[PDB]
A paper describes a structure:
Extensive studies have identified that many RNA-binding proteins, such as FUS, hnRNPA1, and TDP43, largely contribute to this conditional cellular compartmentation. These proteins commonly contain low complexity (LC) domains that can drive the full-length proteins to undergo liquid–liquid phase separation (LLPS) via weak multivalent interactions. In this work, we directly visualize temperature-sensitive amyloid fibrils in the liquid-like droplets of hnRNPA1 by transmission electron microscopy (TEM). Our work bridges the liquid phase and solid phase of hnRNPA1 and illuminates the functional role of reversible amyloids in the assembly of stress granules and the pathological risk as intermediates en route to irreversible fibrils.
The result showed that segment 209GFGGNDNFG217 (named hnRAC1), but not the others, formed hydrogel at 4 °C. The hydrogel was composed of amyloid fibrils observed by TEM. As temperature increased to 25 °C, the fibrils disassociated spontaneously, resembling the behavior of full-length hnRNPA1. To reveal the structural basis underlying the reversible amyloid formation of hnRAC1, we determined the atomic structure of hnRAC1 in the fibrillar form to the resolution of 1.0 Å by micro-electron diffraction (micro-ED) and to 1.4 Å by micro-focus X-ray diffraction. HnRAC1 formed needle-like crystals that diffracted both electron and X-ray beams well. The structure revealed a cross-β architecture (or steric zipper) with hydrophilic sheet interface composed by N213 and N215. Moreover, the hnRAC1 structure exhibits a distinct feature of negatively charged D214 continuously stacking along the parallel in-register β-sheets. Stacking-D engenders instability to the fibril architecture due to electrostatic repulsion and hence is barely seen in pathological fibrils. Note that in the local chemical environment of the hnRAC1 crystal, D214 is in contact with the amino terminus of hnRAC1. In contrast, as we mutated D214 to V or N, although the resulted peptides still formed amyloid fibrils with no profound structural change, unlike the WT fibril, the mutant fibrils were stable and did not dissociate as temperature increased. Similarly, in the hnRAC1 structure, kink at G211 enables the aromatic ring of F210 to reach out and interact with the Phe residues from neighboring molecules via π–π stacking.
Numbering used by the authors: 209 to 217
The structure:
Amino acid sequence: GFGGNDNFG
């Protein structure tokens, strides 16, 4: 998310 992480695996 905004201010954080977005992980696609």
